[PDB]
Design a protein around this nucleic acid. Structure first.
Ligand code: MG
Ligand code: MG
Ligand code: MG
Ligand code: MG
Ligand code: MG
Ligand code: MG
Ligand code: MG
Ligand code: MG
Ligand code: MG
Ligand code: MG
Ligand code: MG
Ligand code: MG
Ligand code: MG
Ligand code: MG
Ligand code: MG
Ligand code: MG
Ligand code: MG
Ligand code: MG
Ligand code: MG
Ligand code: MG
Ligand code: MG
Ligand code: MG
Ligand code: MG
Ligand code: MG
Ligand code: MG
Ligand code: MG
Ligand code: MG
Ligand code: MG
Ligand code: MG
Ligand code: MG
Ligand code: MG
Ligand code: MG
Ligand code: MG
Ligand code: MG
Ligand code: MG
Ligand code: MG
Ligand code: MG
Ligand code: MG
Ligand code: MG
Ligand code: MG
Ligand code: MG
Ligand code: MG
Ligand code: MG
Ligand code: MG
Ligand code: MG
Ligand code: MG
Ligand code: MG
Ligand code: MG
Ligand code: MG
Ligand code: MG
Ligand code: MG
Ligand code: MG
Ligand code: MG
Lengths: 59, 74, 92, 53
RNA sequence: UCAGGGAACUGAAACAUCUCAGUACCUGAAGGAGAAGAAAGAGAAUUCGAUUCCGUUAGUAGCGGCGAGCGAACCCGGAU
RNA sequence: GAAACGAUGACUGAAUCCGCGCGGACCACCGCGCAAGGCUAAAUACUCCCAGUGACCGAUAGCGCAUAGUACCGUGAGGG
RNA sequence: UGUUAUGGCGUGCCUAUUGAAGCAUGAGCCGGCGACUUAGACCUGACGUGCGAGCUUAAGUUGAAAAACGGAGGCGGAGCGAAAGCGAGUCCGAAUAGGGCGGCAUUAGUACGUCGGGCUAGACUCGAAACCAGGUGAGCUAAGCAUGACCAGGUUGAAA
RNA sequence: AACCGAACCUGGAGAUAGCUAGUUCUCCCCGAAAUGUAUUGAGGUACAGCCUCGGAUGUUGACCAUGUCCUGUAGAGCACUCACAAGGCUAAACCUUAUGAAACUCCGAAGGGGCACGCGUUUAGUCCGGGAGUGAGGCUGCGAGAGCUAACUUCCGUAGCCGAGAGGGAAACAACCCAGACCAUCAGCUAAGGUCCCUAAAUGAUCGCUCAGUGGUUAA
RNA sequence: GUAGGGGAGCGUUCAGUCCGCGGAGAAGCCAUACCGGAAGGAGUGGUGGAGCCGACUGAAGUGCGGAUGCCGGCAUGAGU
RNA sequence: GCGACUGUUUACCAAAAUCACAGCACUCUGCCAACACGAACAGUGGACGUAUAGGGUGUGACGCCUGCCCGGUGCCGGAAGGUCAAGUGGAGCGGUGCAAGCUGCGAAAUGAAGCCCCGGUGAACGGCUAAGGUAGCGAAAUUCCUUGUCGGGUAAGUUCCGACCUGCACGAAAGGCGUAACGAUCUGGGCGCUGUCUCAACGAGGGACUCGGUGAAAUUGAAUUGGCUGUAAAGAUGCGGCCUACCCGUAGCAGGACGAAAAGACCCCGUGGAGCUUUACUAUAGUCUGGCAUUGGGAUUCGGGUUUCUGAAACUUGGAUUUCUAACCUGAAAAAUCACUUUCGGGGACCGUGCUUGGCGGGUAGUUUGACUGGGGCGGUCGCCUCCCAAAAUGUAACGGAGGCGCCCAAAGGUCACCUCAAGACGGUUGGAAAUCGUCUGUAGAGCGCAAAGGUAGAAGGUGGCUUGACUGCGAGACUGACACGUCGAGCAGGGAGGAAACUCGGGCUUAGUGAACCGGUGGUACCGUGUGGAAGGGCCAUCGAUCAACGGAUAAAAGUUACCCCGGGGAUAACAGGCUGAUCUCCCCCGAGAGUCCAUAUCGGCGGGGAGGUUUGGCACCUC
RNA sequence: ACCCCCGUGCCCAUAGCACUGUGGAACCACCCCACCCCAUGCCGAACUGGGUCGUGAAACACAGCAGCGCCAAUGAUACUCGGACCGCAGGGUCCCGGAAAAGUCGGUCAGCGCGGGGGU
């Protein structure tokens, strides 16, 4: 796919897939903590599998 | 009618005579069902959790004052 | 989407301009004959792309006195090439 | 979170020489004149923030 | 082959833009082929050098209700 | 879209060699080119036709037809 | 082996289903036709062969009673980041808290082939009601126009 | 131009079809699912669960015992809350006496769960990766709601059997009782069930019961 | 033991290679009490009048009871 | 009764009370007419017509007649104002260059038709808040209750006539009430006749039957195809048990074979279809309108600048007016449409036409119009939080039983310091149930911002002091979830707060106060920036915008109807019947209070109790779409 | 060592309350005065500050005491895991282990430390 590249599901040395902070980004804030201050990174197993089928070769 | 389907969770997450670790949650609770002993910190929602690592054992005192504590392993 | 790819929050960027070919220290030094790399023999040295600049980075640690023509290299790499004795060159 | 015609407000922050937002629920109701507090910028902190926008 | 004109089912699991697709179809001209062609260019090397064709670059740059999805070129190897 | 460039339908309407157009808003600088005139083999596509060939058919297969656009159906296009 | 008499036992097949002898589906019978395929320098696995930290060619040229040539290019080879960029590190950040990653104790990739699947195209086979384009139809029928044809016999008895 | 809420023919075109049928040689191995969450979702799909194959690990699995903790059900009991029966007292209160409870609890099991150990017999487990199917369940007993303490009702829980399970019994009979079919036998023992005749097997033995065909249909 | 995953195989056509068979009779057809764990395979007789088994390897338009499936032939209703 | 009438209409289920009809009314249209066909400044129909004409619309001979209401919708009229597009125009803002200059967003004025604003309009849409029924009619093709009440007819009259009126929901041109005549119209009655009937008989003919000739069809798993009763997917020849039953046909009957026929047309399902509708969404033919061309001259007021005598003159530029003829349009003329030197005539810088601007636009076009659901619809319900159901872990459904949330608090936060409640009993000035004060008791019977549960007395409650940790960079380790989220969090640094201190502080006793992604708004940052140096644009850190509430959210943007309907499916799912059930229904029994002068029982049986049936309306949804 | 007192813990009602007898110059408490440290949303009541006399009244400490609380057996039961059955149903029984609540028998008015002060 051509969307998923500039978004999460980045690919690593272990071919593991990189999640994000979805917690809130732009809208609906003025609420909570260090919790907010995340844009940061993450990962998961079950949708690791069919993820990189989108953006196969070019990581 | 009936309009709450969500469980929260609660219960007691680490029982007595159980090897624990530091940062583990020994209990989830509404009020203080029991209070914290040594080894034990308590968050906003109560929720007794572990400061150190060790064996979690229970002290049940006099019906309604109860305590979770962490005794050393080494 | 009803689900889970959207709902995932990004802009980011693209770019991806100049990116370098990797030539390890351990490649040149240690093993082989000291083919004495510089500007051409490198193509036959088994490190082959072009279309890109070549860059030397430190991996293996051994003493050899060598000189190389590359497009750029790493600080520590220079540090360890001159300190086993040698030279590393950049274009003018 | 949600907003409309209502009272209170969310202003955030601003201050001398630091440029920064606390992003805090305020209110216009009971007591509002100064939205003023003390907060930490890109500086040493130790600096007063006037939250009136 | 070129030009004038130019759909919808369908896909988007609804549907308006988008897709289908400049496809289908209609129409004009022409030949054994046609079209295209001799830089007010490509392009970032003060490099190339008319056009067409194949390989490749490359599902890369980039387009997109940034959705479904669409998707080049320069270099470079070839036919001439 | 920050939309350059080409292309016209309407309306305006320039310079011309220390001139002109381009280099993806724009400017300067640096490069690239000289429009508003023409013609132009070859490599390219196709198969009515002809030849050769086939881990293609062999009579419910193979073209629809081991000849037939016939018999037959339809006012007709058409179908068969 | 063929046939038979008596005894015992015995609810066609398929589908669809919680459940079918079903008074639910399909089918008169036999013959023949009849449905998971193919394509790509595609993706990812299994097995196998060849080279091996290397592995391979594409278009094409030459030769074809047969194949060679052709390194453009493709994949290992370095990761981290939004990127500039840095580099066995990198990013976050006021250096030490973490993310990913190398050293892990450590191996291996690449081209081909067959097979498992994935995507793209009808994509297992058959089946719409519809939608769009070009065209054929008023020799049926709905009407208009032009020009012709037809209405035994009887009754009633308006104006002037 | 013999079917007009938009004619006919050819073409796009093999439209699209979360829908319905159909899908053909053999044996061998394992063996599901009708659940969860999400869904312009509800007879469809994604992920998880449950199947298979390969790899790695190598008892971590399984039951069962001991120890240890967690619990507010059954019961029970009015100490709070609501309900409530009789009497006293001078209608709340208050005392004697006496009860009810899914949303009351002074109390509170049997059981259940987590951890550790194996002190004891067992065999599975976990991780990586390929291929799935399934996402309509059904009945019974026990524990509830709903219902009328109706339903071959419905909706959860829980065990087992159908499902996908043939064989024996229950006259017939998915599910109930007994029990899991690799193959052959004109061999033997049993289970549930049976043993007068249809029919396999005691018209058995001892002490009773009922004269009604009760047996071989229900109540005040 | 149903979906489903796994394993070993039977058979048909074509193909290359090997072994051969055939007018003192090939394939196809008909019967059959043999063989093999199955798919299936032989033997013999009858028919038949040209061609064809077996083994190995490769490739498939490769195995039918169903689809109100298709083309065909022929039954029932009935001598109604 | 309905329509006046002749007539017309659903080829193939409707001939009518439908349609048309003369007549009436509203309205449009002055002639290259309005209107309509149409790539079209072509042509043509309107019409070789000209307002006594033509279009459109509604009523529907004739007779009396036609009321009230314009608030809303439309249509006509109006100008003082409110907004209103391009466009002529450029103060100002920002980029780049040393610079002249070259460039980006772009305004006050000038801006039309629309819409808001005013007034009128009804044989306009319309209503009986703008007003509320004037005639006339009324249980009527309108009437529910209803077989209304009376009366007529009949032995008997849910129909029919007549009244009445209580008009569920008559009414004046979607005409009101009448009306002779008309009608294969609809309704009630009577006379006559009669096989329609009591109630059927006989007779004829043509088939049926028999023989000779020719010889079909739908259908068909196969069949060696009985009855009862029972079981079985809940309607048995094909299972059980019992009964019956020799083999085979011919003529006959129509109970079964859930008999045939057509993959139900009802119903439901499908993010299937199509016709229609409209103040659903979106475009659009058409049409309106400003500007620009085609497109010219002259006069007059007016906005303005260059030129040059001390306010006039002009080389002038646009605007409105007026007018003109050389553009153009258009008619006659010997030459039917054209063409023309043409003699001319009228119109005329208009119209038309091309480009653009804004408006209107179901005339047309593409589409949209959710789900749950003991069938669908209607009603309700979709996310969040608390109890109960929940079977003493966790979890667990219901259109199960109850009740909350979409906030609030600059202090209800941080910290430090102090304080202790509800109630009762005795006594007290405004009291005399409760206030306020005092004594006494007083594990909570109070409080905790809200719902509830837990928790609270060593405070989490009730007061003050200082304050802003309602912080920035992080997160060991865990709870929880398919994921995505969600929660708890020691410890680390920068730096602050309160305390003397140990220390506590990354909001609030906790558990609801919410919302992925996309596209944008703003402040910071300086990573990218298409030759280069900048700038535009982008990125990264904040961050604002969603009753996206159908709350994992379909597009920025969407309602209805089909009885004209189609297709794909469903016994997954309703209406019929059966089945299970028996609430309701039906019926029987128990007890015996009382009635019965006396006595419950000759009859009758309060309040209650127990069953049978399976005829009722249902429940369920099992076989059959 | 023994008595006792003050502080302070573990135990957190079989240690609590009521009734109460003893204790005073050792320790404790009131009472004592307070302009000032400090304070009272008013009062030094409470904080707090300066110290005896005084009484041991009140409070606190110790002791008697079982009227109330509190703890509470044995037996038997309710219920129930497992096993096996009855009844159309409501419901119920048998075997086998586990086994309460309440009530009765009773049990108590505590027990175990540390440091210091003062007696014989
Ligand atoms: Mg941050
Ligand atoms: Mg469409
Ligand atoms: Mg679509
Ligand atoms: Mg241009
Ligand atoms: Mg043949
Ligand atoms: Mg043929
Ligand atoms: Mg069914
Ligand atoms: Mg049958
Ligand atoms: Mg059948
Ligand atoms: Mg049939
Ligand atoms: Mg004709
Ligand atoms: Mg017809
Ligand atoms: Mg099709
Ligand atoms: Mg198509
Ligand atoms: Mg098995
Ligand atoms: Mg389900
Ligand atoms: Mg589902
Ligand atoms: Mg109970
Ligand atoms: Mg279930
Ligand atoms: Mg059921
Ligand atoms: Mg099944
Ligand atoms: Mg089974
Ligand atoms: Mg049997
Ligand atoms: Mg039985
Ligand atoms: Mg052959
Ligand atoms: Mg089959
Ligand atoms: Mg046939
Ligand atoms: Mg006969
Ligand atoms: Mg006959
Ligand atoms: Mg008539
Ligand atoms: Mg008809
Ligand atoms: Mg008729
Ligand atoms: Mg007539
Ligand atoms: Mg005959
Ligand atoms: Mg039989
Ligand atoms: Mg029978
Ligand atoms: Mg008959
Ligand atoms: Mg039928
Ligand atoms: Mg159907
Ligand atoms: Mg429409
Ligand atoms: Mg629970
Ligand atoms: Mg439980
Ligand atoms: Mg989007
Ligand atoms: Mg949802
Ligand atoms: Mg959206
Ligand atoms: Mg009708
Ligand atoms: Mg019709
Ligand atoms: Mg109609
Ligand atoms: Mg059903
Ligand atoms: Mg029914
Ligand atoms: Mg039936
Ligand atoms: Mg059901
Ligand atoms: Mg039991």
């Amino acid at each position: 796919t051509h969307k998923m590249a500039k978004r999460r599901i980045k690919i690593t040395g272990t071919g593991k897939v990189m999640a994000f902070k979805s917690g809130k980004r732009h809208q609906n804030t003025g609420k909570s903590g260090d919790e907010i201050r995340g844009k940061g990174k993450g990962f998961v197993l079950a949708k690791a599998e069919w993820a990189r089928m989108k953006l196969m070769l070019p990581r | 009618n009936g309009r709450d389907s969500n469980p929260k969770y609660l219960g007691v997450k680490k029982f007595g005579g159980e090897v624990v670790k530091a940062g583990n949650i020994l209990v989830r609770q509404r009020g203080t069902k029991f209070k914290a002993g040594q080894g034990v910190g308590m968050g906003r929602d109560h929720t007794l959790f572990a400061l150190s690592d060790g064996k979690v054992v229970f002290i049940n005192k006099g019906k309604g004052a109860r305590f979770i504590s962490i005794e050393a392993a080494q | 989407r009803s689900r889970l790819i959207a709902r995932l929050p990004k802009r980011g960027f693209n770019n991806v301009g100049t990116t370098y070919e990797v030539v390890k220290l351990s490649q040149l030094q240690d093993l082989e004959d000291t083919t004495f790399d510089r500007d051409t023999l490198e193509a036959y040295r088994l490190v082959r792309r072009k279309n890109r600049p070549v860059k030397l980075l430190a991996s293996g640690e051994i003493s050899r006195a060598v000189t190389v023509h590359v497009d750029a290299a790493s600080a520590a790499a220079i540090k360890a090439v001159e300190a086993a004795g040698g030279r590393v060159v950049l274009p003018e | 979170a949600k907003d409309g015609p209502r009272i209170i407000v969310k202003m955030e922050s601003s201050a001398g020489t630091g440029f920064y937002y606390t992003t805090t629920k305020n209110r216009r109701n009971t007591q509002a004149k100064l939205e003023l507090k003390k907060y930490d910028p890109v500086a040493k902190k130790h600096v007063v923030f006037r939250e009136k926008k």
